[PDB]
């Protein structure tokens, strides 16, 4: 991916995070678990539903379009009519296939950027109260109980509070 996160420094995905597209896995003395990140999953679902609606709205429905009949003395306009019908089909087929190919690439890069944005948000929060251990994990220098973990996932982690409590 263009942003190095998905299939990048975060080596793989989580079948155990079921409530969203991006999120957290935590691990402290009380226990472990997954939790989707609602705010960022929501923003992506906004954009992707918008993307799909955009594709729909641009392909107005085809109304009644039947063929025509020609005599054995009208083959030039018969072939012209065939040329027109075939031509437009070749063009909408190209348009349809190309749009989906290009939008598919952008959609995947979009998800990749969203994961990277989330990781950097947490990194910016924890600063040097935790060790960046690669694979997208932060190892805390202080005890981080469930309330501590919950505050990281809310974006209201308290870097001054824990900077004095390092192990």
């Amino acid at each position: 991916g263009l942003f190095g996160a998905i299939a990048g420094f975060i080596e793989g995905g989580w079948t155990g995070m079921i409530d969203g597209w991006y999120g957290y896995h935590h691990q402290n003395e009380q226990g472990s678990g997954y939790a989707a990140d609602l705010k960022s999953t929501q923003n992506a679902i906004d954009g992707i539903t918008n993307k799909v609606n955009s594709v729909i709205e641009k392909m107005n429905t085809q109304f009644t379009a039947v063929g025509k009949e020609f005599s054995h003395l009208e083959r030039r306009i018969e072939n012209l009519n065939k040329k027109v019908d075939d031509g437009f089909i070749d063009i909408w087929t190209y348009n349809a296939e190309l749009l989906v190919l290009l939008e598919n690439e952008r959609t995947l890069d979009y998800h990749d950027s969203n994961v990277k944005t989330l990781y950097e948000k947490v990194r910016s929060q924890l600063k040097n109260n935790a060790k960046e251990i690669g694979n997208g994990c932060f190892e805390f220098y202080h005890k981080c109980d469930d309330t501590c973990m919950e505050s990281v996932k809310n974006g209201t982690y308290d870097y001054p509070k824990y900077s004095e409590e390092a192990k």
């Epitope: 409530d19 609602l38 679902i45 906004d46 992707i48 539903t49 918008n50 609606n53 729909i56």
Partner: antibody, heavy 121, light 109 residues
């Protein structure tokens, strides 16, 4: 705003099943969940279950767990609710309501006008 | 389930309060919403996330949550405010689901 429009009224016999629908304006894909809530005469609302956009996952209340099936035709901007083994106690007004976001939750901010299902012998 | 008083009454211009009491599985660990219901019409959201109002709900409606009990408040009581009021929340009891209170009928004199 958003308009939720339920399908017509239904009158069905016990043990049969009914499939009501809820058509939403705009879209047709939505970024918010939709659930179904019913309310029997002289009673409070009771949630039945809901469905999540893109993921398509569903949650059902324990009381209807096992005989309710919520589905979505996102291209038609429509959501369906099928309830089976109908009892007389199922006679109520059925509403579809949307949630503020993509997860089903206690907060449903916009409701349809409701449709009635009558279950009698 | 959530328990509310079955019925409360007051004269116009007064302030009433509707209590919603649950357990640690519902109200004590999740947000609480309130709905108003008029005869013939669908439930109308008044309060979400314990104490926030949607657009269009007047200043005199308010909510709060203390530990295990939530509370709806209405001031400047009007004749049009005579309806059924329901609290709702996200119960983690058996399988998680949305649970409504029993309801509270508000009568104006």
């Amino acid at each position: 705003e958003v308009q939720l429009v339920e399908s017509g009224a239904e009158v069905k016999k016990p043990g049969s099943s009914v499939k009501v629908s809820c058509k939403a304006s705009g879209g047709p894909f939505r970024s918010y969940a939709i659930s179904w809530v019913r309310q029997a005469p002289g009673q409070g609302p009771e949630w039945m279950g809901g469905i999540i956009p893109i993921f398509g996952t569903t949650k059902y209340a324990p009381k209807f767990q096992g005989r309710v099936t919520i589905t979505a035709d996102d291209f038609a901007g429509t959501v369906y609710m099928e309830l089976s083994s109908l009892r007389s106690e199922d006679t109520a007004m059925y509403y579809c309501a949307k949630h503020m976001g993509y997860q089903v939750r206690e907060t449903m901010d916009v409701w349809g006008k409701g449709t009635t299902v009558t279950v009698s012998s | 389930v959530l328990t509310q008083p079955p019925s409360v009454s007051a004269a116009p211009g007064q302030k009433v309060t509707i209590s919603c009491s649950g357990s640690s599985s519902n109200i004590g660990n999740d947000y609480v919403s309130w709905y108003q219901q008029l005869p013939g019409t669908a439930p109308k959201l008044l309060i979400y996330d314990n104490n926030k109002r949607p657009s269009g709900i007047p200043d005199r409606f308010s909510g709060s949550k203390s530990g295990t009990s939530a509370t709806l408040g209405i001031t400047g009581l009007q004749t049009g405010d005579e309806a059924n009021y329901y609290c709702a929340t996200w119960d983690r009891r058996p399988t998680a689901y949305v649970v409504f209170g029993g309801g509270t009928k508000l009568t104006v004199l």
